[PDB]
């Protein structure tokens, strides 16, 4: 007799603990620079969520890199919202920043998030 | 002001972390359990285990790329828990369950030990 126990909130408990680690700056191994603002994070999480960061950290000449800059035209807010989303499953929006968020996700190669924003636009009002 | 809640996001993130694991990408440590070795990500181990939380929290054994456990810790029991860590699924056979609880106790995985207890009370 073989059996399997499926922990339905496990992935969520793991993601919460990873966010906690981020907030306490524990085991964080990279800083992302957007304009003059910095954001500490874990490459593995960034890679798991962004096709772009996946490439960057897959790139032998930019893998052991401890810092990463982005297009200077990428506003920090939109990016911060995406980073939070990555670590919480929650995408906090305002009618005033959804476009910047959608634009930023597309840049980060997060197509599913771009498409969800579209679905959101579609249902708004 | 709105908030879109991605109900399977955590699970998709966890799967992608297991993919990295299997493709040995960004893995940054090796857990040795007797002759057998296991490559993994420290953050994942920390998220799930108090022991590992304390180990990689220890400024000393914080940067080591290899950690050794008591040799009486059977690899199968450990591997089942490691899998669980990266997939949310715990595979149990009537013959290795007790071993698993015993192993999780070592790794400081109280909830998993308690779930197993709850399991035996029915099976």
């Amino acid at each position: 007799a073989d059996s399997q126990i499926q922990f339905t909130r496990h992935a969520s408990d793991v993601l919460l603990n990873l966010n906690r680690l981020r907030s306490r700056d524990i085991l964080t191994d990279v800083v992302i620079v957007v304009s003059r603002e910095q954001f500490r994070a874990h490459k593995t999480v960034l890679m798991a969520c962004s096709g772009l960061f996946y490439s960057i950290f897959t790139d032998q000449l930019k893998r052991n890199l401890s810092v990463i800059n982005l297009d200077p035209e990428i506003n920090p807010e939109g990016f911060n919202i995406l980073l939070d989303f990555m670590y919480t499953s929650r995408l906090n929006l305002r009618e005033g920043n959804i476009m910047a968020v959608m634009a930023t996700a597309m840049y980060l190669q997060m197509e599913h998030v771009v498409d969800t924003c579209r679905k959101f636009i579609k249902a708004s009002e | 002001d709105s908030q879109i809640q991605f109900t399977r996001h955590a699970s998709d993130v966890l799967l992608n972390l297991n993919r990295l694991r299997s493709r040995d990408i960004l893995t940054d440590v090796v857990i040795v359990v007797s002759r057998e070795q296991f490559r993994a990500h420290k953050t994942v181990l920390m998220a799930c285990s108090g022991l590992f939380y304390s180990i990689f929290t220890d400024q000393l054994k914080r940067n080591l790329s290899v950690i050794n456990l008591d040799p009486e810790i059977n690899p199968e029991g450990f591997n089942i828990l490691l899998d669980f860590m990266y997939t949310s699924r715990l595979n149990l056979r009537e013959g290795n369950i007790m071993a698993v609880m015993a192993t999780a106790m070592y790794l400081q995985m109280e909830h998993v030990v308690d779930t197993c207890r709850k399991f035996i009370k029915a099976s």
Binding site: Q4, I5, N17, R24 | -
Partner: peptide, 17 residues
């Protein structure tokens, strides 16, 4: 075929803020 069982409770320790 394995018997499946679901657990809805917290699966691991909670790392405080």
């Amino acid at each position: 075929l394995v018997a499946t069982v679901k657990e809805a409770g917290r699966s691991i320790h909670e790392i405080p803020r």
